[PDB]
Scaffold this motif. Structure first.
Motif, short mmCIF file in Angstrom:
data_model
loop_
_atom_site.label_atom_id
_atom_site.label_comp_id
_atom_site.label_asym_id
_atom_site.label_seq_id
_atom_site.Cartn_x
_atom_site.Cartn_y
_atom_site.Cartn_z
N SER A 81 10.96 180.56 61.71
CA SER A 81 10.77 179.56 60.66
C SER A 81 9.41 178.88 60.78
N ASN A 118 3.99 168.23 61.80
CA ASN A 118 4.70 167.87 60.58
C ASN A 118 6.19 167.76 60.81
N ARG A 119 6.75 168.65 61.62
CA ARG A 119 8.19 168.64 61.85
C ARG A 119 8.61 167.47 62.74
N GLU A 164 2.56 179.94 55.07
CA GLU A 164 2.42 179.26 53.79
C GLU A 164 1.24 178.29 53.79
N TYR A 165 1.00 177.62 54.92
CA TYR A 165 -0.14 176.70 54.99
C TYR A 165 -1.45 177.44 54.77
N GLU A 184 6.52 178.95 57.94
CA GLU A 184 5.87 177.76 57.40
C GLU A 184 4.36 177.79 57.63
N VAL A 211 2.18 172.68 61.76
CA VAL A 211 3.61 172.79 61.45
C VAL A 211 4.42 171.95 62.43
#
Lengths: 128, 54
Positions: free
Chosen positions: A68, A97-98, A75-76, A72, A94
């Motif tokens: 996952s 951010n999480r 996608e960035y 993600e 990522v």
């Protein structure tokens, strides 16, 4: 239960410990001389190590967590290609951010810089 | 030692702790180092004042 005296203000019994907890004295204290250690922990990147372990406590399977995060991160890079690969790494973005999604606060992509660099051209040299 | 005066084994250390570290920088052959000094005091003296007296 409900009690009002004279002026209509409700009066009530405030709940208190009314009992001795010996864990209160010896546990709400602090060591004073860890400034150097704290600063090195951030310098070496140990903070993200604890954050990764924090995120994995909310995950049932660590292999789907890895997939996952990579999904993600992909996608960035497609969204903003030029902002990643140097001081900002997509996988680090990522993870930070999480952690921020949990409500905690971390710098973006764990990126930090030396404020005592003596101008351009100078590289900090590592003492092995 | 008389008149029943109890000695107190005092440790005279207004500076609780002190440490130094060195950063090295370079651009080619030109080297340059930076000295950091950390000072902890017990409040009887500021760290900046301890640096001056030392």
């Amino acid at each position: 239960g409900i009690q009002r005296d004279d002026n209509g203000r409700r009066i009530w019994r405030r709940r208190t410990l009314t009992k001795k907890d010996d864990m209160l004295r010896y546990k709400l204290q602090r060591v004073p001389f860890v400034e150097e250690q704290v600063r090195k922990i951030k310098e070496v990147g140990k903070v993200m190590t604890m954050d990764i372990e924090r995120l994995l406590l909310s995950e049932d399977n660590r292999f789907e967590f890895v997939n996952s995060v990579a999904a993600e991160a992909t996608e960035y890079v497609e969204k903003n290609r030029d902002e990643y690969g140097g001081t900002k790494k997509a996988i680090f973005h990522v993870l930070s951010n999480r952690v921020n999604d949990l409500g905690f606060d971390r710098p973006e992509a764990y990126a930090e810089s030396d404020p005592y660099k003596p101008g351009p051209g100078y590289l900090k040299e590592y003492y092995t | 030692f008389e008149d029943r005066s109890y000695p107190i084994d005092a440790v005279f250390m207004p500076v609780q702790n002190a440490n130094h570290s060195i950063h090295s920088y370079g651009n080619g052959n030109e080297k340059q180092e930076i000295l950091f000094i950390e000072i902890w005091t017990n409040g009887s003296l500021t760290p900046k004042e301890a640096l001056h007296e030392a």
